[PDB]
Design a protein around this ligand. Structure first.
Ligand SMILES: [Cu+2]
Ligand SMILES: [Zn+2]
Length: 127
């Protein structure tokens, strides 16, 4: 239910599937609304909790480019079965039910700090 905004970009309920026990990878999901008349891209995700990210097409295939394409005047859902950001080399993760602080970097809009809800490894979310 929580949302964020930067430039003409709006991010709705970012959330992630917590890694399995002993694993260092997670999946970041969100709904992104681009109100600009120009395309934009999610080109980066940064945090102290992990050291890098990858952009995946379902299941876990490295995508077209290392970014999430955001067409003008469009709503893009990153969700299980579609596309997501893979959080790699997680060092520190809050338990399920809490939030993980990270910074999203948009190509045009710039940076925004968010708190993604940490959810169970098999969780779903309808926006
Ligand atoms: Cu929310
Ligand atoms: Zn993946």
């Amino acid at each position: 239910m929580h949302e964020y905004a930067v430039g003409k970009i709006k991010i709705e309920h970012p959330w992630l599937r917590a890694p399995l026990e002993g694993e260092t990878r997670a999946q970041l999901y969100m709904l992104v609304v681009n109100s600009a008349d120009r395309p934009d891209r999610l080109i980066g995700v940064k945090s102290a909790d992990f050291r890098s990210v990858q952009f995946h097409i379902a299941p876990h295939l490295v995508a077209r480019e290392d970014a999430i394409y955001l067409p003008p005047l469009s709503r893009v859902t990153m969700a299980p079965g579609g596309s997501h950001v893979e959080l790699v080399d997680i060092s520190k993760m809050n338990p399920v039910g809490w939030a993980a602080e990270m910074t999203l970097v948009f190509e045009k809009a710039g940076e925004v700090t968010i708190d993604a809800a940490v959810e169970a490894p098999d969780a779903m979310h309808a926006h």
